[PDB]
Amino acid sequence: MKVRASVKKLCRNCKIVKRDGVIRVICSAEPKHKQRQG
Amino acid sequence: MFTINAEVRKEQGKGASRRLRAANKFPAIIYGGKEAPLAIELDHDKVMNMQAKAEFYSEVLTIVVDGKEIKVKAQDVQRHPYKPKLQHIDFVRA
Amino acid sequence: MALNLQDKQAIVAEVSEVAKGALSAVVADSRGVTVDKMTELRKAGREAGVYMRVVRNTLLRRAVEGTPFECLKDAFVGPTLIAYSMEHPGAAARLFKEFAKANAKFEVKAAAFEGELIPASQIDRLATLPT
Amino acid sequence: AKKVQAYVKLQVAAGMANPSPPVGPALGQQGVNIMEFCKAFNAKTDSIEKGLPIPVVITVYADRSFTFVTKTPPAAVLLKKAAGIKSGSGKPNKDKVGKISRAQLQEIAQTKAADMTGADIEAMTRSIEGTARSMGLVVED
């Protein structure tokens, strides 16, 4: 998990989801790509 | 062909024209020929869609004001500093 | 499938062969292979050439357009993926039944040689042919 | 038709059997035998040409035996012994490598057209010549 002020889709499998008032990215291919806005 | 609907302005100046543009209209004028120049007002969003094409500037286009047809051409255009909006259009009647 | 012009220009290419053809058989080859499908299409060139328009337009209003012209009993062609193969040389040529011989050549889905009906036939193995 | 199991369509210039490091390491660590290429390879090569790279199948099963079949040379290596040029492309738009006669290719097209697809011989001409044009060869009328 990388906590950065700007979160973007880095691959084709990344998805934007808003969970509990937080924008975060999740993908099923590369676990390095999961990330949240903090 | 391109057909534009316009209305004759009732007042002019700095304040009157700033009110037109806050209501999504803008001023223009038709001059040239033998008659006196005619100051009009005409809808913004409609004439913005027309002028995105490249033959808006190279074609005789009619303006329907007071219910009568007049053939004019676009001579000058005055556009907003940084927004995608128009401010004034000069017409020369043909 | 492309825009409406192709909805009108591919169908008009069909009418060339069906006008002056013969008995035709239909095969539903949904699950094949292109290298295997190559031979079936390249077999056409061996006998006389590519003169058969072998397009597949089996949508409800993509092949039925030419039905009122000829092969009226092919108006019941509403089911799923199929193929069209016709015969110019000779009435009821081997192409009505060579797929039956080719049925065993990894052609599991072969539509059971139902074909089109010029003399109003049914599902049968009409193997008779003057050689 | 049978799927690829452990085999590839490639080898060195077929000129000789030469069951040596040039050929063996393609499949030697996969089992079977390497020196078996000594007699199995010039059986069909003694009459074709000495130096033509032609691919063959190396279909091998768990019985430690492999079946092999030869074929025509590929497109690029074909335009070397009769095209009169041993170089290739690398800048087709920058320059032309040389001249090539179009009547030459379709005379030797049916050499390759035996397995090559196409409606007819003339159809193959544009295919074989197009990659010849990529080489910089100028199609002589």
Added chain:
Amino acid sequence: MLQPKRTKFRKMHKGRNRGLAQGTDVSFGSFGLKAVGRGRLTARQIEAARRAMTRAVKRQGKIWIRVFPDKPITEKPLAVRMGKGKGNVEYWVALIQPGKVLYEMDGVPEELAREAFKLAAAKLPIKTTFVTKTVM
């Protein structure tokens, strides 16, 4: 870094930056960056943004820089009290008003120039947009 070759006077008053801009058109190439905010552009930010957009198109096409840093800026040295004259000239800026076109391109696809102008705009302190040529 852009800088006047020779100048009449060594220093300038501070001034103000009111008004809108002259030069609000794409008059050289096909695409450009129009400034939407107001501020100053130094010579090190103009040079850094030109390196980012030149390296993005692989030096295919033409690029016009359309602003010039002709105004000197001075700073007093560190830990000195007030007064005792004016400071020493340290760098040069260009004053920017809403509407100026800052760069140009021509000779690239319209889709590739948007990406090049996007990497360039990340080096400047002023909000900008992407504009195209007009008939009139």
Added chain:
Amino acid sequence: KPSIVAKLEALHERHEEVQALLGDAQTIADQERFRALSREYAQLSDVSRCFTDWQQVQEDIETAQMMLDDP
């Protein structure tokens, strides 16, 4: 491309010679040797082969020297 054909002819042996040596699993026990083969390229194989070619040709040249009465 004056002499690129010689480079391609040299290419056309290690193009498949390398396979049984990359995965032979005798030169990989130490860490350095695998990447040595990967980066230092194909020196040992082609150099030994070219040495053998040189030895054969030098053996050929030595002969045909004891003859007289002919030009």
Added chain:
RNA sequence: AGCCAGGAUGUUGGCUUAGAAGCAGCCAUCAUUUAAAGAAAGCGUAAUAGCUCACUGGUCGAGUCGGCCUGCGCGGAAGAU
């Protein structure tokens, strides 16, 4: 958007070298068969191999996909009684 099928042909390419074979970087991108398939968009490999994607068929069957101008809210946001 799902759910099934195909998703091809000489390019082990010459171009950089043992390798770039669709997939590190250097020119090109024709042609064939086809309802369709790019001299390869992605993954994955040392080359491999393979798995996808474009495109086209099949059931379903009603809308659907993106930009532009704007109003109000979200994150970025850590200190000492």
